[PDB]
Paper text:
The residues that CV2-75 interacts with on the RBD are nearly completely conserved between SARS-CoV-1 and SARS-CoV-2, explaining the cross-neutralizing ability. An alignment with the structure of ACE2-RBD showed that the heavy chain of CV2-75 would clash with the glycan at Asn322 in ACE2, establishing a mechanism of competition. A comparison of the CV2-75-RBD and CV1-30-RBD (Hurlburt et al., 2020) structures reveals that CV2-75 binds an area of SARS-CoV-2 RBD with higher sequence homology with SARS-CoV-1 RBD. In contrast, CV1-30 binds directly to the RBM, which only has 50% sequence homology among SARS-CoV-1 and SARS-CoV-2 (Finkelstein et al., 2021; Hurlburt et al., 2020; Wan et al., 2020b). The two most potent anti-SARS-CoV-2 nAbs, CV1-30 and CV3-1—which both bind SARS-CoV-2 RBD but not SARS-CoV-1 RBD—did not neutralize SARS-CoV-1, while CV2-75 and CV3-17—which bind not only SARS-CoV-2 RBD, but also SARS-CoV-1 RBD and display weaker anti-SARS-CoV-2 neutralizing activities—were able to efficiently neutralize SARS-CoV-1. The abilities of these Abs to block the ACE2 interaction with the SARS-CoV-1 RBD were similar to their abilities to block the interaction of ACE2 with the SARS-CoV-2 RBD, with CV2-71 and CV2-75 blocking ACE2 interaction to some degree. Three of six anti-RBD iGL-nAbs—CV2-20 (three amino acid mutations), CV2-75 (three amino acid mutations), and CV3-43 (nine amino acid mutations)—were non-neutralizing. CV1-1 binds the NTD and has an IC50 of 8.2 μg/ml, while CV1-30 and CV2-75 bind the RBD and have IC50s of 0.044 and 1.7 μg/ml, respectively. We recently reported that these mutations abrogated the neutralizing activity of CV1-1 and reduced the neutralizing activities of the two most potent nAbs, CV1-30 and CV3-1, but not of CV2-75 (Stamatatos et al., 2021).
We characterize 198 antibodies isolated from four COVID-19+ subjects and identify 14 SARS-CoV-2 neutralizing antibodies. One targets the N-terminal domain (NTD), one recognizes an epitope in S2, and 11 bind the receptor-binding domain (RBD). Three anti-RBD neutralizing antibodies cross-neutralize SARS-CoV-1 by effectively blocking binding of both the SARS-CoV-1 and SARS-CoV-2 RBDs to the ACE2 receptor.
Numbering used by the authors:
A (entry chain B): 1 to 211
B (entry chain C): 321 to 537
C (entry chain A): 1 to 221
Amino acid sequence: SYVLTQPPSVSVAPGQTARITCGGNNIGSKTVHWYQQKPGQAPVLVVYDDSDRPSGIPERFSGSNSGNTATLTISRVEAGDEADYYCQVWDSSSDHYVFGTGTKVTVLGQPKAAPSVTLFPPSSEELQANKATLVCLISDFYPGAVTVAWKADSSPVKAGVETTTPSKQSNNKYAASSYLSLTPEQWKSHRSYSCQVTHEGSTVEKTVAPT
Amino acid sequence: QPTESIVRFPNITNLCPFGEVFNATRFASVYAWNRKRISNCVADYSVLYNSASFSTFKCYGVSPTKLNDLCFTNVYADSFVIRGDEVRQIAPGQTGKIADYNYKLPDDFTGCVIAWNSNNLDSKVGGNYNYLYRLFRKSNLKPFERDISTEIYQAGSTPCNGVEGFNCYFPLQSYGFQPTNGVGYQPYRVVVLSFELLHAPATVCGPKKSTNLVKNK
Amino acid sequence: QVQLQESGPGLVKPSETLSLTCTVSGGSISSYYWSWIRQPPGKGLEWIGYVYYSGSTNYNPSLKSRVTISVDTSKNEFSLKLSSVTAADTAVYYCASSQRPDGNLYYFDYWGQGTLVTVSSASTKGPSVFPLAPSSKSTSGGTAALGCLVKDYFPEPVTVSWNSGALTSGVHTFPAVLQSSGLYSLSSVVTVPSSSLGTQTYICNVNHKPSNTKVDKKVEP
Ligand SMILES: *[C@@H]1O[C@H](CO)[C@@H](O)[C@H](O)[C@H]1NC(C)=O
């Protein structure tokens, strides 16, 4: 089967020209197309016929194909271009359409952002269902690496915590979620609870108390 | 690299007559396919892949988006008509009554297979019986062979002696080609471009300019 | 112009056949190649095959024995059947096409939204929705925060809106958590100007297609 090889990730500064390489055995005798895919969205054609662009794509997108190497050039790199790019070609011998492995282009130098935390107590409707779930929500932070810790008065908790991996939101930032589940008798037995969010050294903490 | 260290292409101006092949009023039976040699002209391939509506445009050994940048000593255009389902046989390494008995491409093929639905022009109400194909043959065709014989095919033990009869068939058969035929059995006009390179000055190139050469770099 | 919309079940058993359907609107099926493409979570795109308006098909050689792609011109749609599925078949399935001929020049500029198909051993379950009451009215910055909690459902996805699509400003839905039990849970919160906290009714509309759970729930302090 034909193989298109791409680097998993590349990084560029805001303003320079990003280049994504797409490797294939004698790919210069094939027509390469490029697709952009942003998180939670379908891929969109950005470059067709080696170097052409659709009417909506700006003229800063360009493509090249020469000697086992196809290159996608994005000039004047902006924050809103941070996405996943795939090359796609049709194989003549196998009569098959192959995609590249994928390249995640991240813009370097985006500012550091502090996480905003909103901790919610268990809904009274849930306590009536003999359940209780604390909800800690985190968003608008960069880089997209976070650490959540919980505490029950003078004793931290770990056997009821469930956290997600950070996720790219629409405004080129990251968000995460953490949940603490426990019985309604454990909820009323502690005078306070705490969600501690650590990000790049600095910490953000909000608390909730059963009242 | 037809002397593209700095831009240097032939000073020719006449356009290649692709229209006389693509826009021909009548096409040939696949058993008797026609060939046109294209030479001594500038070939604007942009008028092909970006114009009209083709059902199949499969190039082997060369990307169609680089044709306007390459030069060849010769380019041949073979045109014929087959069924829509039979177009898949017009490729290297394929088999079938079209690939074996009517039109065979070599394994080292360097060109493009172009095809489009032609039901509205190559089919008549009562059925178009003018397009034929070879149904029987003693062996497979060699690449780019063209058999037009109507020798009675001997399928049995007794010799035919050139008369049709028991186990002695006329080797050609007529397509139906009715406008209400299923889409897979409808006539498709196919044209195959072959890009030939010899040890000789190139005669067919894409539209390019030229400079005037330096004795430097 | 031409818009494509997939439809199909979100859950398949580890040995049954997967059935999808792509409904094309705004145009016609005639004389084009209609393809199926899938993408496993966090992985790359993989072409499955296409269907020509005559009914002829071409499939991925890796999936040739398991893929069936049909077309219905009188209903303006084409379907997909994938037999003997496995865990490696969990993916977001897109349908795509273009106005280009088959081969070399063929690309995908008409895409669908994509429907997620999960292959799991058993236990489909609908979600339980709970209101996330807004914080004690402080009105310092005039920005409150209220949401909904959809807990313990399976499988993905869950689509939540606010005020039947009216309230869209400042809404943020978070990705779900994969619990140890095997069920998903997510939250959806919209920041609200605390000045309309006692007059503007805030409803959240959650939808779980694999379970047909269309639950509406209002939040109040
Ligand atoms: C044939 O005619 C069509 C329509 O008049 C035109 O677009 C095309 O360029 C012509 N030549 C070809 C297909 O080689």
